[PDB]
Amino acid sequence: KEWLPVTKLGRLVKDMKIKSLEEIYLFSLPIKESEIIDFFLGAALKDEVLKIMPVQKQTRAGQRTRFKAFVAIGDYNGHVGLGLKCSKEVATAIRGAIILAKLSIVPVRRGYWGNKIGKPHTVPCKVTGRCGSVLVRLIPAPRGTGIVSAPVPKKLLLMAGIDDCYTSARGCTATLGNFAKATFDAISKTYSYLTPDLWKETVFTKSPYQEFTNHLMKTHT
Amino acid sequence: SGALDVLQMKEEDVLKFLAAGTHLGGTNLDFQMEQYIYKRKSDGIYIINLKRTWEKLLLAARAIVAIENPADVSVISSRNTGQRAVLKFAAATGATPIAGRFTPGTFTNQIQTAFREPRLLVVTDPQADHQPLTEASYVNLPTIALCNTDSPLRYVDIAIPCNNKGAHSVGLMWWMLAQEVLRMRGTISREHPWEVMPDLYFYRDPEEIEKEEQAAA
Amino acid sequence: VRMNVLADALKSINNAEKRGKRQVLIRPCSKVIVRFLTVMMKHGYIGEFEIIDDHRAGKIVVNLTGRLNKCGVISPRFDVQLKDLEKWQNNLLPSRQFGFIVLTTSAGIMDHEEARRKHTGGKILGFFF
Amino acid sequence: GKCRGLRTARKLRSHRRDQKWHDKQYKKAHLGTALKANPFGGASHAKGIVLEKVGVEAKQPNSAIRKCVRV
Amino acid sequence: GRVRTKTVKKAARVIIEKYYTRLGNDFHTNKRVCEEIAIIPSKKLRNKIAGYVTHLMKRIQRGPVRGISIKLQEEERERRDNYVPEVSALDQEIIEVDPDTKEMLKLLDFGSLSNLQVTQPTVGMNFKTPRG
Amino acid sequence: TKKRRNNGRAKKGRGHVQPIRCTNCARCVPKDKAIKKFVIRNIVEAAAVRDISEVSVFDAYVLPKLYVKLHYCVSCAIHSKVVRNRSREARKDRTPPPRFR
Amino acid sequence: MQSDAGEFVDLYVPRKCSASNRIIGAKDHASIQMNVAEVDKVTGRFNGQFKTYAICGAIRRMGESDDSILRLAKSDGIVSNNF
RNA sequence: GGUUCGAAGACGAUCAGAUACCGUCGUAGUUCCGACCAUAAACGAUGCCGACCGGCGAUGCGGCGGCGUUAUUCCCAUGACCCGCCGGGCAGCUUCCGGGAAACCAAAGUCUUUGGGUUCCGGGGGGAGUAUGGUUGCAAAGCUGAAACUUAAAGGAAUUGA
Ligand SMILES: [Mg+2]
Ligand SMILES: [Zn+2]
């Protein structure tokens, strides 16, 4: 249960020096330790297997059937991640899928439909996500509409923390691999989209590495 | 780097550059290295403008000094030419040298024993070290590079327009960066010549060391 | 041949923005283009611009900022009634918060906000958001 | 849409009017022949007199007899 | 058919990197060192490990061994029979300095030096390759 | 599926190129598609050289070479092992194979 | 990003590229932030302040991160205006 | 008009059989002039006109500028090379422009952030480019062109086996 961190960010997290996941997302640091996620959003996160999918390669004699687990994760308040894992056993596939889903959680930005009162409930603007053939477009909807969508993107938008949203998917959506990935691309794009709100000139603070450079010299070589 | 009479090219560095042959580019030009060049000869070689070379060298020196922990400024050279110069630079400043064969995965594979997480990459040739640059696009890692006239500026953030093919030129360019880093820190004084000779950084090939072995006996 | 001049002006801005240029050259300038670009500028999607004046159709050098996503034309120029602004700006614009539909009214060339303000219809030219 | 002129209405309309015939279901409805060939003649059910019983052998991998009746 | 397997080779490289200072040129002494320092479970394996140890170490001195990296240590072994510069590389006489160097040289305030002589600029261009 | 960007031939801006007869067969193939080889052999072989070198009236007569320009259809070229199948990526290399000695 | 009340309601504000004015996303691992040191006018020594520059991932792999950093430095007065 | 070659056909072999491949003959034809026919994997399997968006090296035609080489020995000046620049053309290489199901394509890009202009044309696989009517041609046939009925797949790119 003891976590001895193999990365430098993971160290700073464990020593109680970085005190929010937003101070990492701001600097776009690749999170390579799963325990960083389980530290901040520890008790909040909820797993759900979307599908277990057997894939077979033909060899000298017979197949090699190995399994492939799609796992959505995220606290129902502004973080979502999707992890795929392929192994010989379904127990091993689901375990590694939960971990890969955790490492790839993102901040979902939420805005309003029209009247700018309460908390942000829906998607800030229209966003499109693409994977192979599938194309998932999120449109903002008025308050208490719910998620008017297919069950796969519905539970990804539920877990993301969006209350209201229209969708309009095109392509071979039966493919639950690309449908959920196109949805994940769409949700992830909400914060890499420039609106007149993000126009005020950026004021740069210090990197967590630069600011706590003094500490990382003595804590581990 | 500029607008300061203190930092301008003093009464030695030019003859040192023009002796080393730093001002001689290749026969081919990269479209992004046009600004750093003066004029093309008949002979078909590009002449590099030493003033902008010098301005890039001092801006590179600034970016290196700005790092608070001098340990995590990784310096790299895979070619025979720079393998000594990088070790001498690193020993002088306190940088972390990788001279010869950067194994793919030292930045993105946390399991490897030779796994570093540096804060500023310094390369001798983008063509030779095309592996650390492309691997430095997977971790947020700014880059300095001893770029020739034809060397591409893909993932390169400060290109020092020099002649990185020659032994004397590479060795001198590493020496001048090392000296500027220490001058700007306050280890060396601005006015007195650094007691290190720039020839400590040059590549002594096994034929010429056989000659120097003979010369001493 | 060049049948729509505003169409090519806005496509050349769009490619220049995407590619990450600081400024762009528009070839055959016109009142409608200059009147489109002043509406853009007035909200602050483009900086200043300078209309280079030969003894022909002029040229425009526009100072691009990096705060324009898309600027597109609508050909043909449909007769947008006032009661149709909503169902146009519902499917053309990204959100109800930002983005504008410039349409040529009797008053002049202006966005859907000012056309609603002055109680006027007209013809859709394009949109920027 | 391909042609986008502000008075290309008879073009777009006449084009669509012609190209709806290439739809299998539309043509099967709007040409007479399907209804003219249909034994029921476009009706829900129909009464008919049984004239013999028949054992129809089922298709492939399935292997059985079907208790059909000629009416 | 005397190819040593990864077992013998890896064990040899790990033994040298940890215990360089004991192992030497003699096979029999560093057989006895490897015997003590390494809990090796068979005698033929110990002899093959010890055998390859006094082959790697008998070539560390010659120079550029790759797989084993006690790097400054190999450098300090290189620094024993030193031919150190008394008067180092560029402590010399007049320098050959290209008349087109000399125009880029008085683009500063330098026109000349004690050890600067302006030779002859390049004549002719046999430089490109016929396009066949 | 499209195999070769140029459709196994050196035709780009024509439409028609006069056909040519395969030397092994007599198959009509387009001139630019045909596998061409230029063969320059001595009229006598290798070991017969010294026989005809000394049983000749003229001192220092450089006996002539026979010059043959061979065209093959793709079928004959592959069968007679002039050309062979290559790796999907290695097909692209147009550089003629090394003749040194 | 505030409601009618004026409470700043979105959970963070992403940095914007110093060159192209694009916003640097959470999973953009090809972006940089480079601190260029400040020199004391007379001594020629490091003060303890610096001019930081953020750059987008697309700009870097395009290969304009070099000329972009150059323009930002030249505008901030680090690099000489003659150059 | 008929040199060569060669549908038909005459044989000779091979083969279980050969009405084919292989071989010796060989009429129509292949060639020229004048009337027809209007189709090809008639292919870039990719309509045309216009604008915008990376780099490099060559190439064919026209122009423009420049050390030097060679002929006109008198070299003004033209021609043959050399080094670059501009515009049209056939192509090539390269890259995280971007797209695409991919193979791949600086166009097949600038497309859910969907609208520059316009012509033709496709709608699961068969039945079938069939029947029928019309029209063109001396004939062969061309252009236009369904239905009843049958069917759960046919198919495209790429992967791992045999
Ligand atoms: Mg043809
Ligand atoms: Zn043949």
Residue numbers in the entry:
A (entry chain D): 58 to 278
B (entry chain B): 2 to 218
C (entry chain X): 2 to 130
D (entry chain Y): 2 to 72
E (entry chain S): 2 to 133
F (entry chain b): 2 to 102
G (entry chain W): 1 to 83
Show me the paper's own sentences about this structure:
The 5'-UTR of the (+)-ssRNA of the Dicistovirus CrPV harbors an IRES that is able to direct initiation towards ORF1 in the early phase of infection. Three domains connected by flexible linkers could be defined: an elongated domain I (DI) at the back of the 40S head contacting ribosomal proteins uS3 and RACK1, a second domain (DII) formed by a dual hairpin at the back of the 40S body interacting with eIF3, and a third, large helical domain (DIII) placed at the periphery of the 40S E-site, contacting ribosomal proteins uS7 and uS11. Interestingly and in contrast with the HCV-IRES, the conformation observed for eIF3 in the complex with 5'-UTR-IRES is very similar to that observed for eIF3 in the 48S complex, with the IRES ‘filling up’ cavities that are present between the 40S and eIF3 in this canonical complex.
Two main classes of particles containing density for 5'-UTR-IRES, 40S and eIF3 were found in the dataset. Masked classification and refinement in Relion3 revealed two major populations of particles, which differ in the degrees of 40S head swiveling. In class-1 (open conformation), the head of the 40S shows an almost canonical configuration with very little swiveling and no tilt. In this conformation, the latch of the 40S (an early defined contact between the head and the body of the 40S [Frank et al., 1995]) is closed. At the other side of the 40S head, access to the channel formed by ribosomal proteins uS7 and uS11 is exposed and eIF3d density is not well defined, probably because of a high degree of flexibility or low occupancy (left). In the open and closed classes, the positions of the 5'-UTR-IRES relative to the 40S head are very similar (right and B). The main subunits of eIF3 (a/c/e/k/l/f/m) show a similar conformation in both classes, having a similar orientation with respect to the 40S body.
